[PDB]
Write a protein that binds this ligand. Structure first.
Ligand SMILES: Nc1ncnc2c1ncn2[C@@H]1O[C@H](CSCC[C@H](N)C(=O)O)[C@@H](O)[C@H]1O
Ligand SMILES: Nc1ncnc2c1ncn2[C@@H]1O[C@H](CSCC[C@H](N)C(=O)O)[C@@H](O)[C@H]1O
Ligand SMILES: O=Cc1ccc(O)c(O)c1
Ligand SMILES: [Mg+2]
Ligand SMILES: [Mg+2]
Lengths: 242, 239
C-alpha cells in the first residue's frame, strides 16, 4: 500500500540488543556457538548477514537452543512459520531424526531459495515440505484435514509478528498435548518493557504493542504452560496442556 | 579468620539491557505462573544473607519447562541452598518422580523445607548433606544402567563444575541433560581481566572461562549456552 518506506534501513531498532553487553554477546557466539555451528549453517548465516532483511535472521545462539529443545523432547514432526533464508529451518532439520518431517511455510520462496543450496549440502532437504503461502490459510486448511495421530511435536513461529495471537489459536490445536510452540521475538528489542517508546517505525511500534498484548495473553492462557527466555530477541516456549 | 555477601562485587543478577526489561519478564511472564509455595520460598530467601545465590525466577520457570518437555522422571540437583530450583523441579516432575538433592548445608534446605512440604512434593526428594564430589563418586561405584538420571542441575561451588561434569556425563543417561547455572558469571566471563572482584569471584570467573571452553570442545555432549538469569549451559549426553 502507499505510505512510508518499510525497508530494514527505515527501522529504528535494528542495532539495539537485549543484553546490556555487546562483549558478552560476542563471547557467547565465539565460545559456545560458532565452534558448534554446522558448516552449512555458517555459510547460510554469512550470506544472510549481507541480505537486505538480515535483521530478521534468527540469532545463532538461539539456533543452538532450538536444536537442543528439539533433541531433548525427541521431536519428529514439526512446523515452522516464517522461513526466510532457512537458518532455523536448517537448524531444525539437522536436529530431527533421519525420517523427521517439517512443514515450512513462508510467503516468499525466493528467500528460501537463498538457503536451499546450504540445506541441500547438509543432506536434510528431504525432511522439508515447503509451502509458499500466507501461513493463516495453510493453518486453517490443516485444522480441517489434520488427524490426531499426526499432530506436530513442535512449532516455531517467526513470521509476521502482529499475527502471532492469530497463529496461536490454530497452533494450540495443531500441536500435540505436551508439544511445544515457540514464539520468536517476544521481547522485541526490549521495547515491550515500556508502555510507550518514542522513535519507532510504525511497523516496529505495531509489533511492540502486539507483543505486549501477546505476552499478557500467553501468561493468562490455561491451555499452555509458558517460559519466556531472554535469548536472541526473546522467545516464549509454550507447552500444550490440553 | 574469626569475625562476622556485601564483601562481593557481584550482587545483582541482570545480564539484560535494563532493570526494566528483567522486571517486565518477571511480572509479565514469571510471577503469574509461579506456584504459591515458590513465591513464599523466594520471598523468605530474598531476605537471607546469601540471597544473591538464589536461582533467577525466570530461569526456574525455564528449568520447569525443560523437565516437562523431556519427560524427565529421575533427576539430580547439586547445590540446593533454600530449595527454589529443587521445589521447581519437584513440582515439574510426575507424581512418581525422584530427585537426589545434594548440598553441604542442610540448614539452608530447612528454610525451604516447609514450602516443599506444603507443596506436597517432599516425597520426591532424597536430600543428602555432603560435599557433592564424594556422593557422585560413590554413586558411580554402585549405580546400574536402570538408575541413570534424566537430568542434572549443577548450581553449587563453581570451581568444581568441571569435576562435576566428569561424573555427571556417566550418571546421566544418553540423551539426558546436564544443566550448569551461572556460566556467564554476571557478564565477567566476557573479559580476560576484570577489575575489583573478590578473590572468590575472580576464581569463579577464571573457572567458568575454562569450563565454557571445555564444554564447547567436549565430544561427549552437545551444548547450548543460554543468556537467561546468570547464564546456563544445557548439555545433552551423546554417548
Ligand atoms: N503472513 C505470512 N505468512 C507466512 N510467512 C510470512 C508472512 N508474513 C511474513 N512472512 C515471512 O516470515 C519470515 C520472517 S523472518 C523468519 C526468520 C527465520 N525463521 C530464520 O531462522 O532466520 C519472512 O521470510 C517473511 O517472508
Ligand atoms: N561442595 C559442595 N557440595 C554440595 N553443595 C555445595 C558445595 N559447595 C557449595 N555448595 C552449596 O551450593 C549451593 C549454591 S546456591 C544453590 C542455589 C539453588 N539451586 C537455588 O535454586 O536457589 C549452596 O547451598 C552451597 O551450600
Ligand atoms: O556464590 C555465590 C552465587 C551467586 C550466584 C549464584 O547463582 C550462585 O549459584 C552462587
Ligand atoms: Mg525472529
Ligand atoms: Mg546459581
Amino acid at each position: 500500500g502507499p505510505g512510508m518506506g518499510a525497508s530494514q534501513d527505515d527501522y529504528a531498532l535494528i542495532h539495539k540488543n537485549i543484553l546490556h553487553s555487546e562483549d558478552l554477546l560476542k563471547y557467547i557466539l565465539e565460545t559456545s556457538v560458532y565452534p558448534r555451528e554446522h558448516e552449512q549453517l555458517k555459510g547460510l548465516r554469512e550470506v544472510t548477514e549481507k541480505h537486505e532483511w538480515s535483521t530478521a535472521l534468527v540469532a545463532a545462539d538461539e539456533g543452538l537452543f532450538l536444536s537442543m529443545l528439539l533433541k531433548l523432547m525427541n521431536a519428529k514432526r514439526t512446523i515452522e512459520i516464517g522461513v526466510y533464508t532457512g537458518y532455523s529451518l536448517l537448524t531444525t532439520a539437522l536436529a530431527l531424526p533421519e525420517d523427521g518431517k517439517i512443514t515450512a511455510i513462508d510467503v516468499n520462496k525466493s528467500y528460501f531459495e537463498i538457503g536451499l543450496p546450504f540445506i541441500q549440502k547438509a543432506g536434510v532437504e528431504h525432511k522439508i515440505n515447503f509451502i509458499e503461502s500466507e501461513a493463516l490459510p495453510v493453518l486453517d486448511h490443516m485444522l480441517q484435514e489434520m488427524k490426531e495421530e499426526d499432530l506436530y511435536d513442535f512449532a516455531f513461529v517467526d513470521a509476521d509478528k502482529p499475527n502471532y495471537a492469530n497463529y496461536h489459536e490454530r497452533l494450540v490445536k495443531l500441536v500435540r498435548v505436551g508439544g511445544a510452540i515457540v514464539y520468536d521475538n517476544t521481547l522485541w528489542f526490549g521495547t515491550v518493557a515500556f508502555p510507550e517508546y518514542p522513535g519507532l517505525h510504525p511497523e516496529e511500534e505495531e509489533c511492540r504493542v502486539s507483543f505486549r498484548n501477546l505476552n499478557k495473553l500467553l501468561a493468562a492462557d490455561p491451555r499452555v504452560e509458558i517460559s519466556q527466555v531472554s535469548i536472541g530477541d526473546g522467545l516464549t516456549i509454550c507447552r500444550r496442556l490440553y
